[PDB]
Amino acid sequence: LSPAVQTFWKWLQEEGVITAKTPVKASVVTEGLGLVALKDISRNDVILQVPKRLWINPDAVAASEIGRVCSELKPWLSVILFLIRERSREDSVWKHYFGILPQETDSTIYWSEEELQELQGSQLLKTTVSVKEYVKNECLKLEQEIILPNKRLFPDPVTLDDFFWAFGILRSRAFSRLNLVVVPMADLINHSAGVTTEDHAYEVYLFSLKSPLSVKAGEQVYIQYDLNKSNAELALDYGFIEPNENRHAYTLTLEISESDPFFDDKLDVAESNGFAQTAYFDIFYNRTLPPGLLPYLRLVALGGTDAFLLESLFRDTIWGHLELSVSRDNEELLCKAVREACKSALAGYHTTIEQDRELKEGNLDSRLAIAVGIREGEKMVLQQIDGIFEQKELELDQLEYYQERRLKDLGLCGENGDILENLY
Numbered sequence: 001l002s003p004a005v006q007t008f009w010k011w012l013q014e015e016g017v018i019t020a021k022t023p024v025k026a027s028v029v030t031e032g033l034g035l036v037a038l039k040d041i042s043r044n045d046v047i048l049q050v051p052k053r054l055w056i057n058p059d060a061v062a063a064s065e066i067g068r069v070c071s072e073l074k075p076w077l078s079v080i081l082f083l084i085r086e087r088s089r090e091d092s093v094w095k096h097y098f099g100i101l102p103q104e105t106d107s108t109i110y111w112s113e114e115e116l117q118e119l120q121g122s123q124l125l126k127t128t129v130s131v132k133e134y135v136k137n138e139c140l141k142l143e144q145e146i147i148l149p150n151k152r153l154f155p156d157p158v159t160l161d162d163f164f165w166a167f168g169i170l171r172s173r174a175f176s177r178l179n180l181v182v183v184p185m186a187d188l189i190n191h192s193a194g195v196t197t198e199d200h201a202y203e204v205y206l207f208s209l210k211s212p213l214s215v216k217a218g219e220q221v222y223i224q225y226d227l228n229k230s231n232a233e234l235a236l237d238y239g240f241i242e243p244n245e246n247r248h249a250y251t252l253t254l255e256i257s258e259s260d261p262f263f264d265d266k267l268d269v270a271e272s273n274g275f276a277q278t279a280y281f282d283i284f285y286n287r288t289l290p291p292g293l294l295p296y297l298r299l300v301a302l303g304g305t306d307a308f309l310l311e312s313l314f315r316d317t318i319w320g321h322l323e324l325s326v327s328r329d330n331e332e333l334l335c336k337a338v339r340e341a342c343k344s345a346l347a348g349y350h351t352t353i354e355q356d357r358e359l360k361e362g363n364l365d366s367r368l369a370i371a372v373g374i375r376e377g378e379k380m381v382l383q384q385i386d387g388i389f390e391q392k393e394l395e396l397d398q399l400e401y402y403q404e405r406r407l408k409d410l411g412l413c414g415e416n417g418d419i420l421e422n423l424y
């Protein structure tokens with residue numbers, strides 16, 4: 001199989017973790033290293049368990065030499081350091097484990113500059129940059145506020161690579177369904193679209209991993225890393241994406257600009273209804289628009305004419321009105337805004353959707369494959385969004401705005417009330 005692997009398997013045997021009782025062995029798979037069943041495994045059948053003596057979470061670090069200095073650092077920042085540190089120490093408990101970890105994955109955080117060019121204009125790139133940058137800054141501070149000031153605790157130098165490595169290890173290996181825990185044995189299980197349950201991680205302590213599917217002997221055991229992540233999200237978190245178009249999403253960022261002459265009132269309406277000065281709306285392919293997006297768009301586009309809706313008089317129905325549409329100029333404005341944003345965004349890519357689809361038809365490198373897939377999907381969402389609002393522009397007169405809704409109760413054709421009035 002492999003040196004480090006064979007050595008790693010041994011290490012788990014003597015640690016009492018794995019035994020000749022476990023129905024699975026390590027194997028080289030297209031997804032790297034994975035867990036191949038040694039015998040017909042059944043649904044919900046536990047395949048392996050690990051002693052909390054082997055975790056690597058905010059509970060292992062704090063109980064370590066650097067626990068004191070990291071006591072004030074965010075949980076992840078704390079674990080990254082612990083990971084890097086334990087990596088160096090040629091005696092650490094995670095010696096053989098670290099020997100197995102990949103130097104890299106296909107997460108966009110490791111992509112070269114050429115590789116990233118393949119994501120030109122893509123939201124995924126904007127996001128990966130932000131995340132890389134932010135992690136960078138955050139990690140430098142830890143070098144000058146904890147790494148250097150404590151040269152006793154952090155011997156060997158800590159390169160920016162070491163950071164991204166550890167950060168990567170967190171994003172693609174840590175289990176969040178329980179925090180951030182790392183489990184040497186259950187770190188090898190891979191992801192599959194075949195698993196549609198997402199009920200595997202569980203501890204009795206002891207981390208117990210149960211196979212959500214019946215895997216016949218020889219086959220690989222899988223799990224569902226997350227039924228809710230977009231492809232953009234899997235691309236950055238792990239090094240892969242799915243062909244499932246239902247994973248393509250594009251998030252829109254709305255906000256009530258402070259320069260808005262009705263900023264104070266608008267923000268008041270937004271917060272009274274669960275929305276901040278800045279709100280993010282994730283838009284998934286083939287899914288209906290997220291609730292609140294339209295009403296918020298209408299709020300953003302409001303305008304002097306319909307500003308009367310911001311008066312204390314409607315501070316109990318204003319949101320309902322926002323949901324039912326304000327006025328034609330309001331709707332026309334917001335549609336114009338969204339449509340221009342889509343066109344502008346779409347124009348930011350360096351390939352046409354046809355080109356991407358043709359590319360997908362050949363053999364693509366894992367990273368190029370991710371870029372192509374991601375960018376095509378984003379374009380599908382950008383175009384679907386734009387299509388939705390294009391239609392809306394056409395139906396711009398089918399909506400019954402505020403003024404109309406207000407007169408839908410005049411009772412012009414009632415009784416000859418004057419008769420009754422002249423009766424006193």
Ligand SMILES: C[S@@+](CC[C@H](N)C(=O)[O-])C[C@H]1O[C@@H](n2cnc3c(N)ncnc32)[C@H](O)[C@@H]1O
Binds near residue numbers: 032102191192
């Ligand atoms: C939790 S680790 C899995 C263990 C990994 N296979 C190894 O060799 O150690 C997750 C990483 O494995 C790979 N992986 C897992 N599921 C995959 C899939 N369905 N397709 C491609 N790569 C996958 C990715 O690089 C991902 O970031």
